[PDB]
């Protein structure tokens, strides 16, 4: 259930673990290499922005665009009208890869992680964040 | 040319973000669609570009996705002004889309870039336009590099 | 002592990162209304009691949704000078007074759900703090009903 | 008047501004120490509520419900429907006092004297705006 | 407009605010940052003075010259005859620049803008009307 | 009822660990083991109660480690003061607990409160018999509510 | 051969690492996060109380009555008649819930770890930790 | 006489307020100081160990060695057996020296004036307790 | 390719990692804890100084001599001549010790792993830690 | 301001992090070679022009790289100065416009060629602040060329 | 001259005395200063470079220079066949100056003067050997 007051609670702590400027790499790379251990076979995936290397320019860039798609959803989580066509363009852009569906509730574990690590664990609400986070993935998917 | 100085993009990257943090509610769509009012009122025939996205019903989610997306774009540029290394890359991404969209030629980025320097001023509370002027164009003529 | 300085400024501080006037209306009226849900459920008081029916779509609901919740935000940040924090109280004591309908229950059920609500929106709340504060502030503003 | 892009720079400088805890009840005092200064025939009409001394709980306590009724105003500014009950709700509390438009132009006055001074940035023409925004609706 | 007591009010407060030396010139790029961001149209109205960047020694010098004549205005507030016939000097030197009554608008309000947030205590009455009475003289 | 403020759970909390930390020796046995001859001493039909634990010879292991764990009890809820979400999950559990034990009664917990007042004054250093009994009792009525 | 020695050590370095307040949930959450990681069917063993999300107060009740537990055995370890006692209560509260056998050695593991974690590595003495562990989690299995 | 619980809040105190290294050597000189100016006849009793100069290294020395006495006396404050052996080993010490009843009684009240003053808590009564308990075991 | 602008970027990187006095030992521990996570089976090869207690002295003595001896490889990269016989040597120290072929990838993966955590992730030149670090063990495994 | 003393401060810091006089002489070599091949490249600048032809093994070629080097060093260093630096900088352009066949463009390759080795050394160069405290130098150094 | 071990002590004592940015040109102004004081017959060998005015933007190039070649030299100070190729280039500059042995041997003891008063640890013996080397390859 991505209620109301949990939609709130998400867009806070996000902004809070997202950050400014060269703080955002530092929750996108916690993101990669959770996911990358977790899956090793979602690397692959990203050869065209050089996954093998997630410090190179290039695959920061890939992973800011991410983060900068997923800050746009977050930031819509009370807009729904609006959201469902954000999520409906970021499926175009995922659709027919051939990405594993599994890449994606391996994705949104590692973010919540990776958002955990950044604002603290205690009182930490994952109810409110897996809720929410797969509303999102789940119009990105399939 | 000008240059986007250390201080001008602290400057900059800060004010920016105190207004487009995911934090907030309603301020994205209200300030991304002023831009493109703007926009659209300075150049007529800009608007012909946007008609995938619902361009004359502005209220429309469709639409208020297309301006917060373009816009969310600009932000995440703003924010890689302090790793220039990836802001080059992303920049050449950037490029790389708009040169294939028909249409879209550099002389547009300058009327962006007058519709962002009218709508700033406007809503954020502390607003330096030399600094934005500075470093938009830093970020504009990464993306602009091709049309 | 009940409500004491530390508690006061601790629930000063969540509160007031939770309702400011920063905020967007629509994200400040989204947690009134789910105050007021939670109030109507606790109390059983009936909506037709407030103007706009306890509609969240009327916006004379959400105008009056705006107006208790501020009342109880000037209570809140004045919880550090009780003489103040009196005084409003007893304003809003003689206000209810003149409002028929509105019991000691009701007003202790009310401010539960600003704690309850609060907690939900900011699980990190200091909840005893604000158990105790907003007792205090029910005990004011329910003083006779 | 008052659009949406002032709306934001208005709620972000008056929350800025207004502060927390007894920053409020000081800014409010102070608020309406401008307003008796910039118009001395305004002390009168609060005589209900302890004016005789400034810092009595009485006072600080109507300081504190204009303020903040200010607060939940500019907090709703930019949800025009809801702001106009709230207006119209204060506009009704207000019929009987028998005030005048000199009175609503002497308390723009004295926000716009306070509200800068505790802060970096200020612009006068958003806030001149969306304060006759505000007053023209409890005004009626 | 600008009575002798209201005169005292702003020669001290614009004083405190416009301070000295170096502090004059980055108070007077913020007064015209100010009316830039306040009136975007006026800018184009500085082409000649080097504004297309706001921190340099041409544009610097322009901003001190109209806060600097400001000073001047406001330290013969109290001197009727002195200020009218200063005044009607720059009445002829903006004659033929093509402003209107918005462009005076508009720097009145960046001066309400600026000056208080380097000030513990401003009275916006008595500098509305003491704007006036100097904005009034230069418009003609 | 009382309450026990910010600053009280701080005084409580602080004094309340230099006793009953797993840093020292011989002090957790001393204190509880003093706890239980208090209580048994103010209320005579209480040692029945304890029955399975041969409180009729207090120097047993058996004994002992019921004092311990009986009082380690309040130690883990003394320190989830900080974090009150918690401390009502943990009261809700140690009054279930309770509500199983026939004969176990409400007023069982005021003489178990009278015996904490009595020998924590003995044995911590700084001590401060307010505070203590405020926030005993935001813990003991979270346990005893039910019987 | 957890000596007399070694109790000292254990005694004083656990009470460092468990701490007071919320200190003590830092040092919890170190230790179920690893068991879990390392042993994912441990988390079903833990349904009753909300194992699915340790950051419930639900399941951080728990939590801490588990490190409560373990608290109150490494206080009494320089007092083995006691430590006895207590170790044989314990034992009734976990006998015939079906918990496996490998559940004690990994939870070992992890809270060594978790220990060790927080009060640093460097001279850390894992035979006194694994030695007065394992006497202590062989009075409850089984 | 100085009960188990009584036992831990003196264990607790003496530590905190005797401190370690150098502040040891301070508090001792302090202890024998005002034991001296307490009861003026004592000094003489430490003749043997440089007394005439109480910041000499012997007597220093001598002062450690009797709150070094005190210090591992009340780390066995709990363990009745070893410290009733101890006790009769320092009386056997002290049965040759001529000492009486008094002279106990002034050691007492110097530990009572400055074991507190290095403490933000002090039990009075735990510590007369406990220092009747160690001093009875040494006068015999 | 190690080239010589890689070499001297490694050199000030590793020693900045490296570091001194006991900060070597918050290294080598890094990488141990790593390899070990990742190969359990590499534990056994260092029964001899107890691997199984990385804790103890005598690991942490065996830890230091091969950083010490990584130190002394890293410090000559821009002396081939000289790191030439430095390896030469290094390979008498492992050959017929059965070690397995992939105790060396790993050593590698675990080293660089543990300096970028040591130094920070943004902007790390993986292209540099691998092929210089590759370059060395080559030298003496085989 | 091009090259503002936000990033002149940045820029002198991370050049000194890298060229240094308690360097090894070879490292500095290494380094100032790379340039020089960076620059060869970019500009197609012949290396006979040069004292020892561009062969790295030349101590007469090395010595020339240490002078150019150096000459970079002594601008960068100075780049809080403006007024000694744009004396600095009117010297090496009097000494460049004595120099046949050194074109301003060249002069702009070679600068280039120092910001791309020094992030390439120290990969957490702020590459913008180098560039335009470099293009700085350059316009300075190439003025009329 | 100069050997192995002391062009590491060189090395590094000079680049923790030389600094960086403005600390060099401070430094350098320094190191002329000294070397005028010492000799002063010197400094009119400077009257192309603005010498008038030692704090000039035209004199601090040139001591910038200098230090600056002394820094390129020293960075070089272990790779012979480099610095050797370096010094020749230098002797070739100077040759038409009329420059004598005194003139470098002020210049030396300018050098000794200003590099130990920026440092906690010099080593006059290396510094000297070294600087003669240097010296030694300017002078031809
Ligand atoms: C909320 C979650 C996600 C969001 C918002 C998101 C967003 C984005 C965005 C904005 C781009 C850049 C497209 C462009 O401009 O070219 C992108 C690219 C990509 N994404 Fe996602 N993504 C998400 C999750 C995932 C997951 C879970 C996977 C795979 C396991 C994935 C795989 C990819 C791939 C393969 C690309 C293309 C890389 C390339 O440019 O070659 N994404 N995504
Ligand atoms: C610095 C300013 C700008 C930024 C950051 C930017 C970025 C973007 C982004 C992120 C999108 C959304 C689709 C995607 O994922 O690629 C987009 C689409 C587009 N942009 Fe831009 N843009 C900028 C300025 C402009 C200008 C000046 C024009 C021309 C008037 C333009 C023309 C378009 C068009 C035609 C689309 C496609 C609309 C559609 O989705 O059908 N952009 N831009
Ligand atoms: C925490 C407790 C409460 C607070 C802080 C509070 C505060 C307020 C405030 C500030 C107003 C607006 C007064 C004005 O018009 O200026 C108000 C109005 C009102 N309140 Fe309350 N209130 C509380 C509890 C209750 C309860 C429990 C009830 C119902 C049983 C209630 C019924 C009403 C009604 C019906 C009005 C509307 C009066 C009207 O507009 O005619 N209130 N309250
Ligand atoms: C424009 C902003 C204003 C706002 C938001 C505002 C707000 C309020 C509020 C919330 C109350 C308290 C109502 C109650 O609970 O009984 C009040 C009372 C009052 N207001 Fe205003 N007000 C404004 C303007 C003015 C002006 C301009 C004046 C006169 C100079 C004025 C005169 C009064 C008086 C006399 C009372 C009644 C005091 C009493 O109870 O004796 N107000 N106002
Ligand atoms: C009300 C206060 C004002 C004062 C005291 C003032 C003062 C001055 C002074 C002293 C100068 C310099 C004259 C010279 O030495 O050449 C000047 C120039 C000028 N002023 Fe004003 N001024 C005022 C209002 C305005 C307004 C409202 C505008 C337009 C928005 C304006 C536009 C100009 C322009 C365009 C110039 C000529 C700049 C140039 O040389 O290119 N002034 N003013
Ligand atoms: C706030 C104070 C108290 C706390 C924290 C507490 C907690 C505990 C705990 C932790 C145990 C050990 C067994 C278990 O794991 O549940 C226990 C057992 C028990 N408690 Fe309490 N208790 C408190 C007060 C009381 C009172 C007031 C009584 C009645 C006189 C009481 C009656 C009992 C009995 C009869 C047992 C079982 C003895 C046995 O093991 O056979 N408790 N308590
Ligand atoms: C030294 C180690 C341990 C100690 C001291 C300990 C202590 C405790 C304590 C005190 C409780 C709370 C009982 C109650 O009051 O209801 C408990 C519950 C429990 N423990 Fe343990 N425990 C330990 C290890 C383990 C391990 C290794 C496992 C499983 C892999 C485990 C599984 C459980 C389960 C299943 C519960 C019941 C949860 C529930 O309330 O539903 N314990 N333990
Ligand atoms: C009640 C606490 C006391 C303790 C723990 C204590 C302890 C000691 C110790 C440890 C020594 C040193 C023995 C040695 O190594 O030779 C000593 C010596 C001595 N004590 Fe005490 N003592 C106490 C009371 C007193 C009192 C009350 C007096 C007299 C006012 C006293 C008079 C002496 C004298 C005269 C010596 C011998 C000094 C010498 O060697 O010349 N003591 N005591
Ligand atoms: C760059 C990488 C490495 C370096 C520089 C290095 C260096 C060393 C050195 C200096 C010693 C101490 C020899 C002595 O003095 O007795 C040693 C011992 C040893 N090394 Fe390596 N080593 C490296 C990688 C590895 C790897 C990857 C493994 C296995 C997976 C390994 C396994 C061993 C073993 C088994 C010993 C003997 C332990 C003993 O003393 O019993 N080494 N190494
Ligand atoms: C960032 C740009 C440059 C800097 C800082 C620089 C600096 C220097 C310095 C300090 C010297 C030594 C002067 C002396 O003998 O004392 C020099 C010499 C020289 N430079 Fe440049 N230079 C630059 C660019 C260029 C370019 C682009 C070329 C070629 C197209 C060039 C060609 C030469 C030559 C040939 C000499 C040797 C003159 C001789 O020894 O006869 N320079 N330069
Ligand atoms: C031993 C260390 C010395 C070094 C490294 C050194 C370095 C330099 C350098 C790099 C220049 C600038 C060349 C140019 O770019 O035009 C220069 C110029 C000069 N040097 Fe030296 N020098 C040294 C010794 C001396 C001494 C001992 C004197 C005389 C007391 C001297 C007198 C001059 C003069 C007169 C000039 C020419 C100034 C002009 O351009 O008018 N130098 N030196």
New interface residues.
């Given amino acids: 259930d991505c209620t109301?007051?949990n939609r709130?609670?998400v867009?806070?702590q996000?902004?809070?673990a997202?950050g400014?400027?060269?703080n955002?790499?530092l929750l996108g790379?916690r993101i990669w290499e959770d996911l990358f251990a977790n899956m090793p076979d979602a690397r692959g995936l990203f050869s065209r922005v050089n996954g093998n290397?997630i410090?190179?320019?290039?695959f920061?860039?890939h992973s800011?665009?991410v983060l900068?798609?997923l800050?746009?959803c977050?930031?819509?989580l009370?807009?729904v009208?609006?959201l469902?066509?954000?999520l409906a363009?970021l499926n175009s852009q995922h659709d027919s890869r051939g990405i594993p569906a599994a890449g994606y509730p391996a994705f949104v574990a590692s973010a919540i992680s990776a958002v955990?690590a950044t604002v603290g664990?205690?009182?930490?609400?994952?109810?409110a964040w897996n809720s929410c986070m797969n509303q999102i993935v789940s119009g990105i998917s399939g | 040319s000008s240059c986007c100085s250390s201080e001008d993009r602290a400057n900059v990257m800060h004010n920016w973000d105190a207004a487009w943090s995911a934090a907030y509610s309603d301020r994205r769509v209200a300030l991304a669609q002023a831009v493109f009012a703007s926009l659209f009122s300075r150049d007529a025939a800009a608007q012909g570009l946007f008609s995938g996205v619902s361009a004359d019903n502005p209220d429309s989610a469709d639409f208020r996705a297309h301006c917060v997306r373009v816009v969310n774009g600009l932000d995440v540029a703003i924010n890689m002004l302090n790793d220039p290394a990836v802001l080059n890359e992303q920049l050449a991404h950037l490029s790389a889309q708009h040169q294939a969209r028909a249409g879209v030629a550099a002389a547009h980025f300058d009327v962006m870039a007058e519709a962002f320097a009218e709508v700033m001023p406007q809503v954020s509370s502390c607003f330096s336009s030399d600094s934005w002027n500075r470093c938009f164009a830093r970020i504009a003529n990464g993306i602009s590099a091709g049309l | 002592e009940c409500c004491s300085r530390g508690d006061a400024e601790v629930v000063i501080s969540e509160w007031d990162q939770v309702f400011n006037a920063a905020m967007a209306g629509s994200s400040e009226s989204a947690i009134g209304v789910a105050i007021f849900d939670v109030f109507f459920t606790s109390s059983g008081v009936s909506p037709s009691m407030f103007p706009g029916g306890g509609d969240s779509s009327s916006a004379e609901f959400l105008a009056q949704v705006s107006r208790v919740i501020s009342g109880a935000d000037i209570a809140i940040n004045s919880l550090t000078n009780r003489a103040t924090c009196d005084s409003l109280l007893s304003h809003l004591n003689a206000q209810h007074k003149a409002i028929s309908g509105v019991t000691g229950a009701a007003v202790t059920h009310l401010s539960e759900a600003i704690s309850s609500v609060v907690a939900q929106v900011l699980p990190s709340a200091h909840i005893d703090a604000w158990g105790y504060c907003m007792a205090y502030i029910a005990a004011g503003i329910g003083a006779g009903l | 008047v008052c659009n949406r892009l002032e709306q934001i720079l208005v709620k972000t400088q008056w929350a800025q501004s207004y502060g927390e805890a007894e920053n409020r009840a000081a800014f409010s005092r102070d608020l309406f120490s401008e307003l008796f200064n910039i118009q001395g025939s305004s002390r009168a009409l609060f005589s209900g509520v302890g004016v005789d001394d400034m810092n009595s709980a009485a006072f600080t306590a109507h300081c504190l419900r204009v303020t903040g009724a200010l607060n939940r105003l500019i907090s709703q500014l930019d949800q025009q429907a809801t702001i106009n009950a709230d207006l119209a709700h204060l506009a009704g509390q207000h019929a009987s006092r028998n005030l005048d438009a000199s009175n609503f132009a002497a308390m723009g006055q004295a926000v716009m004297s306070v509200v800068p001074t505790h802060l970096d940035c200020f612009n006068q023409h958003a806030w001149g705006e969306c304060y006759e925004r505000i007053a023209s609706g409890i005004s009626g």
Same sequence: chains 1, 7, 9.
């Fill in positions: 109301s007051l709130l609670l867009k806070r996000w902004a809070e997202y400014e400027g060269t955002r790499e790379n290397d410090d190179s320019s290039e920061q860039a800011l665009r900068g798609g800050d746009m977050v930031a819509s009370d807009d009208p609006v469902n066509a954000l363009r955990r664990a205690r009182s930490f609400d994952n109810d």
